[PDB]
Amino acid sequence: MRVVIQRVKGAILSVRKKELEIISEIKNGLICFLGIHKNDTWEDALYIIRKCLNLRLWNNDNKTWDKNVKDLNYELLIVSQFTLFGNTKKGNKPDFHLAKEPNEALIFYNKIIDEFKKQYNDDKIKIGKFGNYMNIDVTNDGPVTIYIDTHDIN
Amino acid sequence: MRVVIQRVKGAILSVRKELEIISEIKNGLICFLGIHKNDTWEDALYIIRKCLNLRLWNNDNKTWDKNVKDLNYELLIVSQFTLFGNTKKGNKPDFHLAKEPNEALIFYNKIIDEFKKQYNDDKIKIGKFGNYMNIDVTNDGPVTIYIDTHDI
């Protein structure tokens, strides 16, 4: 699994059907663009959840990188992003094979969302809409982009 | 060098003057660019080449077909040492793998000139390198592309 984490003062998620409809809003917290790999195991998912929930990305008083999302009662917007497995090594049309197939990613993703809610709180974890087009207004703070790829652990 | 490429309807880059807008793009790419302590100019070339030609837009009835240049769109290159945020360590990131902020800025700027020489210099927007920015992005998709040159 691959995750791109961005720190936000807020995030607005719309889907279609005046044309766009808002279905998700966080204030301060993280947006996590989440890529599911074909061979991804549950130990991989737990690693994402751990870091998103536990990475200290906020200043507090004198100190920096001192406080994680939970410490400050912040929110989390988890969007699925298979394009993180867009292969671009070979020519310019990106290649998506290594990304887990949709029906299997959905069910995976949902386990992951549930686990987010267990490790933290239902009301703090926003999702979007799986494999549907989205319009996400993201107020980036800093900005701060963290990139983790679980296949780099073991 | 690392790059997070996001596809946007537009992006507004502000700094602390409470905020004041300094940069803006409409449809195009925001690119979060992490410079590595070892990066060569060839590393830069790959990111630049890829950012400009990766065909990340539909051309009605075809998918993944048009790049930023083709559609005459813009790019916002913003510097991100956070991309070598070392997160294996603990719950506190350190960022020692990034280029030290003086050689990084010189490098950055050189990249921007090349982004410019290769596209057309009215379409490359930047931020204030050293500074805190608040950047509102309208993610279009969304579509996030991740490239590390050390994976080649």
Sorted by where each begins, the domain ranges of chain A are 1-154
Q: What is the DSSP string of A100-138?
A: PPHHHHHHHHHHHHHHHHHHS-GGGEEE--TTS-EEEEE
Which chain A residues are Cβ-neighbours of B136 within 8 angstroms?
A: 137-140
Q: For residues B7 and B41, is the Cβ–Cβ distance under 8 A?
A: no
Among A73, A71, A49, smallest CA distance to A123 is for A73
Whether residue A89 lies within 8 A of chain B, CB to CB, comes out as yes
End-to-end CA distance of chain A: give it in Å, rounded.
12
- Secondary structure class of B103 (helix, strand, coil): helix
User: Which structure tokens are listed for A138?
Assistant: 């993201």
Q: For residues B128 and B20, is the Cβ–Cβ distance under 8 A?
A: no
Burial B129-150 (b: 16+ CB within 10 A, else e): eeeebbbbbbbbbbbbbbbbbe
Whether residue B12 lies within 8 A of chain A, CB to CB, comes out as no
Rounded Cα distance between A86 and A37, Å, is 11
Active-site residue, selected from the candidate residues A64, A83, A139, A150? A83
Rounded Cα distance between A143 and B124, Å, is 19
Rounded Cα distance between A141 and B7, Å, is 18
Rounded Cα distance between B113 and B1, Å, is 17
Whether residue A84 lies within 8 A of chain B, CB to CB, comes out as yes
Q: What is the DSSP string of A61-107?
A: TTEEEEEETTTTT-EEEEEE-GGGG-B-SSSSS-B-TTBPPHHHHHH
Which chain B residues are Cβ-neighbours of A143 within 8 angstroms?
A: 32, 78, 80, 133-135
How many CA atoms lie less than 13 Å away from B85 in the CB half-sphere? 24
Q: Residues 36 to 75 of B: which have CB under 8 A from any A CB? A: 50, 53-56, 64-65, 67
Q: For residues A7 and A150, is the Cβ–Cβ distance under 8 A?
A: no
- Secondary structure class of B117 (helix, strand, coil): helix
Burial of A40 (0-12, 13-18, 19+ CB in 10 A): buried
Residue whose tokens read 């001192």: A66
DSSP secondary-structure letter at B54? Answer: -
Alpha helix locations (H) across A4-83? 42-54
**A1-154 maps to which CATH number?**
3.50.80.10
Judged by CB atoms closer than 8 Å, whether chains meet at B91 and A84 is answered as: no
Rounded Cα distance between A82 and A102, Å, is 9
Q: Write out the H or E segment, with its range, that includes residue B110.
A: helix B103-118
Rounded Cα distance between A38 and A95, Å, is 14
Kindly indicate whether the domain formed by B1-152 is annotated with CATH number 1.10.10.10.
no
Q: CA-CA-CA-CA torsion for A45, B37, A31, B30, nearest 10 degrees?
A: -130
Rounded Cα distance between A116 and B109, Å, is 40
Angle at B23 between CA A14 and CA A58, to 5 degrees: 65
State the maximum Cα–Cα separation within chain A, in Å, rounded to a whole number: 48
Active site residue B138: no
> Beta strands A2-16 and A134-149: pairing type?
antiparallel
Q: Write out the H or E segment, with its range, that includes residue B42.
A: helix B41-53
User: Which structure tokens are listed for A135?
Assistant: 């319009």
